[model samples]
Target: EERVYQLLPKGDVEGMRELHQRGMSFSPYEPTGIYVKPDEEVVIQVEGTQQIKAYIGTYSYEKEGPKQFNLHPGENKISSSNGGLLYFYNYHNTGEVVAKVKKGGTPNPLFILGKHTTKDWKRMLAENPDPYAIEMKGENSLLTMHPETVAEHLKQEDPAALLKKHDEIINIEHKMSGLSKDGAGVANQGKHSIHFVEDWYTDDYMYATYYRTAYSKGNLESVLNLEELTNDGWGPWHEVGHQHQQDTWLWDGLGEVTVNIYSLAVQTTFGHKTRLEQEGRYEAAFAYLGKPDAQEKMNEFEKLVMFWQLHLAYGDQFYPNLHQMYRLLHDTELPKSDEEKKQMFIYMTSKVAGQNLIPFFDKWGLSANDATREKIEKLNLPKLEKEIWLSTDSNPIREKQIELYEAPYGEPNNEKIQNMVIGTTYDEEKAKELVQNLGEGVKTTGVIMQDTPEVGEKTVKVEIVDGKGNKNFIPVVVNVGY
Candidate 1:
């Protein structure tokens, strides 16, 4: 009610007086947001190559000291001594550089980085000497692309087309919200190693993940499998720390914790993949490390872990598709009292979005078809537009639903060209368990206005749902003016 004085002082007393005779207007409100990521500044021309080859022995940790921390030379192979770990550097955020060289490669570049020290790899050295990260200098820096343009360019860099270049560049794991060109999102989750990186590796914005040096695809696969295994209860890995958390598992017989070599393996494997993609030198990295078995193993991931992981044998892998089918349904329209429109909204949100989305499709707690998504990914598209434009950036923005019919550059619902699927919904707040608590900044206030109703006004009964969900009506005074 105190707000009334502010308006009254601003010469708006006349409006308050009018409201004294008539009720004010009220309108419903909704939130605006988007789920995708913004594309970053990228250098179009990349002009450097960093490669390390393993030829003979094995390089990894085996309950030893620091002296084994370097790559051990082997007879036409590769290996590492104890205390040995591989390393790599990353240009965190100054800007993103496109890792394409002589293209037609896998969108998720396979260039792997090594992260371990087995026998003959490095001799009893406590510290790992592998330099995992590097900066790839390019020829020309184009004027930066706007956010929208960058997003469009990225959408154009499809994985199907990029997979062929999987071997040419240094692969780094992202710790962000959206997809890489590979349609993968934050595959390697959490803080990796805290390795010291070269200062030149970073620009004004880009930096490094201190926890790790190099990340590889095989590391990603192993971490994912381990994530799955821990969730499944075969855990208690000693290295999992004191907390009984998300991915900690204790194997039945093996008492040792398989320490996470996340960045190490990723960096090593990435180097290997680069050689393979760029020069088809399958064994170059192996020749350098002296351990050919590395390829037989990690060809998986770097940063190397996102959601899941497997165990023991380096050849096997695992992942759990936890929420692949939970879909949300959303729509936009002005509120109306018409029976038909109300029923239409109700039917759409509840029936089509609810029933068809979850009841018939959700296999809650049941193992889903492992290959469903992978199969959908293989669909061939003779062509898909490189960019798609929306009316504005705010997501779930309510525009005339018909406007989609007039999309400018690409065909509407072009997934039709390649058996694609799209899902959207607004039923969010109620979908997850919410804890009710007041935070640092929150306040609420209200006002009550009354009128004499000319001393003879009647009352109106408004029917609505009470807290118990039953219909009820309460009489409210209908104010009148003199």
Candidate 2:
């Protein structure tokens, strides 16, 4: 009998021990943990009436695992000799449950598995505030959310209030999503939080927005800004997609787009026809674009928009091209020639899109000189409206642009912000040459660079004076190669 079996009946004190010492296929901050190993078998005797659900087949951190199984009541044996790990979860089984060593050969490494209950949640419910909060305890971290912020929806309300709450929920949902992606590396441990706010930067704002906060060992703090909930709000999404993990563009882009569609659905159904007073308002706010039940139209709208942007910036073969470029840069052995890389990109994209990328681009634009906007207009997509973007009829230009004389991309290991050339230079310093026509209505007050605990991306802070004379610090870009 397993020694920990004595602690099992003491309420939630569960048994998780290594037989030949197993390896735990555990998700960081996740509620479930699976004890798995290769070339080994685990005899699991079901002590209760609850159905045991587990994921089987191949497992990898890169993508989700395949196949699943249920270990029903009675004695059952699971063998990992076939390969892959198991993702098993014991969901509130009151009956006794245990995994014992029937006849152990050599166990793998000592893998630990654990489960968490709603102990924190129950504690929070006892003390409810206007902006009630709940702390969800995960394996290695704690996630808290402001549930009371959406009290507008919970007050036995009508659809109008519910609609408003729906918007709030979407905001909270984003915060939750952002927080879930926190923590370090494979198994995200440590502390993090998700926060919701209303009447931000102004009063009478009915909408909600969120941000995330993280803490270090000594309780030092940092924040992940959620000020703007956009895939390409202001940052360089294309460049960002490249700097992260290999398949980040496909997976993160898909996930973000899916969430956007869900948010649109909620907005169209319950939201009011209120014009959002912000830039890109019409495009971002679906309540103003279409009536409910226009998911198909909205999907097409997003696809066309994404398609246009990608085509305009990097041609239609962006993904395969990206893949090819990535492999060339990082591949082992001799680097593939640029043409070979392009061919590789073509092959990958063909499999992905189920058609040649060049043809797709051509179908969208047969005319040689037609603009992307013009082509999109010709599609005659119903319920899709447009908003005016800041652009000149023909080349409305900026004069006083900062031109970095030496390092346009900056030098590696440099600690200080270096000066860059502005517009043009003269033999002698000229006043106009010093500060000529600055672009936009805003100006950069200062710039700063600092080291961070995280690796990969260096930080660049741009201090800007907006048209309102208000000062704000924006992170220019991380995940961009220095």
Error of 2 at 21 (Å): 42
Predicted candidate 1 versus true structure: per-residue lDDT over 1-482, tens digit per residue: 00000000011111212221111211000000101111211111222232212111111111231121111122111133321221211212112222221211111111112312233222311232222211111110001111222223222222222221221111221111110222211121111111211222223221212121222212222112222212221111111211111111212211121222222223333333221223323233223232324323333221112111111111111111111010010112222333333223222222211121111111111111334323322432122121111111111112111100110110011111111012211112211111112122311111111221223232221222223332212122232223
Provide TM-scores for the models.
Answer: 0.17, 0.24
**lDDT per residue as tens, model 2, 264-363:** 3222233322112223433542332323333334343333233323222332233323322232221132224533433333334333333333333332
**Judged by TM-score, which candidate is best?**
2
Candidate 1 wrong stretches, greater than 4 Å: 1-181, 184-196, 199-315, 319-482
Ten consecutive residues with minimal summed lDDT in candidate 2?
13-22
Q: Where does model 2 exceed 4 Å of error? A: 1-35, 57-67, 90-171, 174-258, 261-482
Clashes of each: 142, 2
State candidate 1's TM-score: 0.17
List the lowest-lDDT window of 10 residues for candidate 1: 1-10
TM-score of 2: 0.24
Candidate of highest lDDT: 2
